[PDB]
Structure 1
Amino acid sequence: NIYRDLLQHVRALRQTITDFTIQGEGHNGETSEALNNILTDDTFIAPIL
């Protein structure tokens, strides 16, 4: 339940990022979430890999 709650909170944060952007506006192969936010930007990487 604790692990599922942490994962659900992460997915709720992702849906909140998705909510506060406007879709359908993609310039030069970058989607709208990657052009608005950073945690949805594919150029930025995790601190550890």
Structure 2
Amino acid sequence: LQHVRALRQTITDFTIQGEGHNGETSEALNNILTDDTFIAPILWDCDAL
């Protein structure tokens, strides 16, 4: 359970708090895990299309 919630400890540690950009949830520009252009085949419960 909590080392992929220590993976919560391992995809918001090694970057960054101080400066962000252009209004999409967060700091969204992002990259390939965390912003506002990944919804999907996601066809289970409810949030993303």
TM-score w.r.t. length of structure 2? 0.46
Q: 1:30 to 1:10 in 2, by over 3 A?
A: same
Q: CA deviation at 1:43?
A: 1.5
Paired positions, count: 43
Question: What do you get for the CA RMSD once the two structures are aligned?
Answer: 3.0
Consecutive unaligned residues of structure 2, counting only runs of 5 or more, are 43-48
Q: Percent identity?
A: 100
Consecutive unaligned residues of structure 1, counting only runs of 5 or more, are 1-6
Q: CA deviation at 1:28?
A: 0.7
Q: 1:9 to 1:42 in 2, by over 3 A?
A: farther
Structure with the larger helix share: 1
Higher relative contact order (CA 8 A, sep 6+): 1
